[PDB]
Amino acid sequence: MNLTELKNTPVSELITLGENMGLENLARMRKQDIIFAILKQHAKSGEDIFGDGVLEILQDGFGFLRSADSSYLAGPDDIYVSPSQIRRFNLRTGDTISGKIRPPKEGERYFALLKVNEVNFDKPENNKILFENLTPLHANSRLRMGSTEDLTARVLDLASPIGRGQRGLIVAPPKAGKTMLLQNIAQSIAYNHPDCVLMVLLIDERPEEVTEMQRLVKGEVVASTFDEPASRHVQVAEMVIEKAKRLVEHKKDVIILLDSITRLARAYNTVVPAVLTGGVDANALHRPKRFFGAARNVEEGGSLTIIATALIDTGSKMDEVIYEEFKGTGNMELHLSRKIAEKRVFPAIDYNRSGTRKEELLTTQEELQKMWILRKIIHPMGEIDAMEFLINKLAMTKTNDDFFEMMK
Amino acid sequence: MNLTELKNTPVSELITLGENMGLENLARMRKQDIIFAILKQHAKSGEDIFGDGVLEILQDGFGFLRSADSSYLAGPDDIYVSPSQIRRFNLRTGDTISGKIRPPKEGERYFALLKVNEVNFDKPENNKILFENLTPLHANSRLRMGSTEDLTARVLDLASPIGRGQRGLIVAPPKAGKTMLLQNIAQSIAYNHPDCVLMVLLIDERPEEVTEMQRLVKGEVVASTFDEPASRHVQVAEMVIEKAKRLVEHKKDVIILLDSITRLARAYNTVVPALTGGVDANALHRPKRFFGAARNVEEGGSLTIIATALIDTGSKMDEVIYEEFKGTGNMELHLSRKIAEKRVFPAIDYNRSGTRKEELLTTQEELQKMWILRKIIHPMGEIDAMEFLINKLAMTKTNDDFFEMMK
The missing domain is CATH 3.40.50.300 (P-loop containing nucleotide triphosphate hydrolases)
Known part of the structure; x- marks a missing residue:
């Protein structure tokens, strides 16, 4: 649904929400894997999944929006950010990024930043x-x-x-x-x-x-x-x-x-x-x-x-x-x-x-x-x-x- | 334009300055990186690039004229100074040096001291x-x-x-x-x-x-x-x-x-x-x-x-x-x-x-x-x-x- 709002919902509530999408019990998984499962499974609806996070550019050139509710602990439900996406906006780690996100295609590991809406609570190009x-x-x-x-x-x-x-x-x-x-x-x-x-x-x-x-x-x-x-x-x-x-x-x-x-x-x-x-x-x-x-x-x-x-x-x-x-x-x-x-x-x-x-x-x-x-x-x-x-x-x-x- | 006058200008001013030269926005880079961009793009013309700095001679024999407005912190818009220049003028570290500077030839990292004009506020050979x-x-x-x-x-x-x-x-x-x-x-x-x-x-x-x-x-x-x-x-x-x-x-x-x-x-x-x-x-x-x-x-x-x-x-x-x-x-x-x-x-x-x-x-x-x-x-x-x-x-x-x- 909306990434941040999911990670802000009690585990139990998420599991019921997960089951109720025909996703077989994953009550024994980490909150985070659940969240991922729930996203990937709710990819029957283009234009919906919003995502937000703080950006940590790793040295390879790409970064990740990471979330403040896991005290920025890198996890499966972090959101990959492309090196181009970083250069097109002059992104910098610390940057707070909002937008839409997309399930991994055959071969990726992470939902990806699809559209940048807000950067720092301001116009992505300001x-x-x-x-x-x-x-x-x-x-x-x-x-x-x-x-x-x-x-x-x-x-x-x-x-x-x-x-x-x-x-x-x-x-x-x-x-x-x-x-x-x-x-x-x-x-x-x-x-x-x-x-x-x-x-x-x-x-x-x-x-x-x-x-x-x-x-x-x-x-x-x-x-x-x-x-x-x-x-x-x-x-x-x-x-x-x-x-x-x-x-x-x-x-x-x-x-x-x-x-x-x-x-x-x-x-x-x-x-x-x-010394x-x-x-x-x-x-x-x-x-x-x-x-x-x-x-x-x-x-x-x-x-x-x-x-x-x-x-x-x-x-x-x-x-x-x-x-x-x-x-x-x-x-x-x-x-x-x-x-x-x-x-x-x-x-x-x-x-x-x-x-x-x-x-x-x-x-x-x-x-x-x-x-x-x-x-x-x-x-x-x-x-x-x-x-x-x-x-x-x-x-x-x-x-x-x-x-x-x-x-x- | 003029390195030291360039160093003594406020970032925002240097920003509007560089943007005019069709420099794609730099506000997000460091005062010294901005200065270097501005210097790089000012590659034309040729006799309008003057530099000054205090000289630091590293043991490898070469030196850099470093800037007092940075409290002499090694940075990009430091000017390179060659052993041969160091030796033709008997320069020593501390030496305050003025002159024209030329961009890096490809393969180089720094603008270089082209011609020593003044040394320690005096005729280079004094x-x-x-x-x-x-x-x-x-x-x-x-x-x-x-x-x-x-x-x-x-x-x-x-x-x-x-x-x-x-x-x-x-x-x-x-x-x-x-x-x-x-x-x-x-x-x-x-x-x-x-x-x-x-x-x-x-x-x-x-x-x-x-x-x-x-x-x-x-x-x-x-x-x-x-x-x-x-x-x-x-x-x-x-x-x-x-x-x-x-x-x-x-x-x-x-x-x-x-x-x-x-x-x-x-x-x-x-x-x-x-x-x-x-x-x-x-x-x-x-x-x-x-x-x-x-x-x-x-x-x-x-x-x-x-x-x-x-x-x-x-x-x-x-x-x-x-x-x-x-x-x-x-x-x-x-x-x-x-x-x-x-x-x-x-x-x-x-x-x-x-x-x-x-x-x-x-x-x-x-x-x-x-x-x-x-x-x-x-x-x-x-x-x-x-x-x-x-x-x-x-x-x-x-x-x-x-x-x-x-x-």
Whole structure:
């Protein structure tokens, strides 16, 4: 029928749909093979089968539209794209392609891209590269964040203002509420900034954790699991980052929530051809540094913002090295405290250690001053005292109300 | 059309430019690829293709004139330079070369240097190497630094004078406005010292930070970013210093502002054939070489370098690196997080800054005047001392302060 919509339907529903086309039980096949079976069998109707996907040009010259719902895991129901088709449109990997598709003829292995309708959500023949846009100081247009969840959005909004195009780093030790923190931001963004394109990208995740994130986030959730090869971790991050740059080349504001730059860097360490610094090849740290390095606010419009957690206190040398190597790359950083989290104060933020560069570019003169006053007062305070002090006081109400009335 | 004018034009403009020449749309290719296309299609006529670049001579004997607007990153529209050209003119890497360029003959990859017009800004057949020029202190001939921004420059000017030839170290903890300082310093060099060649070298930087600087400096701003490799950090750096020597080699005053000598040092540490805290003794050699180059050249010209040394990064190596540079310098500016945390902006902790042979950079009148100031702040603590200096400077400018304030 319509490719994307099929892959978005529960397996069971697909099997019944499959049986009901006289296709003998294939309940024991992978969702994907089923989808393929259902396409090939529903090739009694020219002009119907639509297809969409993100393009990965393989070096032979041809590519594949791959789908975001399998976290771009190459599969039988990917859609071949011809080298000519790539040259006629100036296609480039990362490109989001829609159109019509056609069953393989005698001798092929894949449905093929028959007609290009949309490229990047724009006219297939209508755009200059990420690599050449002037990178202003990620900070003109803020992204602000009566419940308790809002407590995080709110503590966060005082410690570490994020702006369209920030390169943020959440430094988190284990069991320090980093996921909730991430989800809180994903929620904050969906609800406050629908205009921004949201992608959450999960690197070496526990499978169940994926389905959870997958269910809360309004936006693209691509993940790979500790199940899968480093290659596969690398595949996922590469495809995402590229789609990302295409969207930006169109003046869109994309946002990537990267869970675990550090795990990504672990991947590149084992996929990159072998100078050691504590386990990690220096040469490896390149591609990651690239990935984060892309975050930027574009002068001609659009924004690529990236927030990535960096794991710490895991008692692994390499995790520690990777952190040190990113120290300074970012322009917003938010520290989580094991201490605060051992004690159960939840937004677990180290206000004294977090903050962003060029805040003045992301706040009003009124806001900063107010922030600066709050800061004067939290400096001497201890990690834990500092969070509690800020919550009990935020507990009064909202954010402006907080201060305006606190001044008595 | 004109290579370098071609390099200094905005992509969109180059796009509309190439499209006119009936070039089928290129927006999707790299600034340098677009430039090459535009150059290729401009294959007719023949005497209207001029090139310039800094020369990099690879060991195989040949070289490329590489472009400063790319921070000398090997790319397509690099110009090929032949051994025979290298040898007929006794060219050396660093050498800034101008002339006509010809497209690639079929089988070739690059436009080629057709005719050498100018070398290092001089007649191609017109200099003793930097490495054998007498190296005075440079205490001689000073580089001095109405509105509130001069407060920085004027504090700098009393705390730690800089001379044509200084080998200054700026010691900077994080968030102590070490960048503003640099930008201040550069602005002060452009307005006051237009005659001196200004080179701003950014080592391991954030892209956005690069484009800021590139937009304030009046001079050459060469930068590698953190997405590039150690090799590239090293490259940019080594290409910069050489271009500086060849220019001192012609009696010019050159000032390099080096943001993080310490990053440069990280670069060398990974790139160098393989410890004291993660850092191999052997690596620092070149960094020191680079820093070591600063000098007032007796036979004319001078190479001055001011570099930041990052500190309090909680990184062992950053720490050992600063260690290894102590005493290599002849001016230092210390920045203090304290003064910073309290929103004072100059940062400089007076009592720990200073330059050597001040007497050579300062008339006897002024020297004494500074000694008194010094006697007075000495007991004061950091914060105090800056705040004291900023109120008392805020009343006026340079000389016109001391006079009256004394009675």
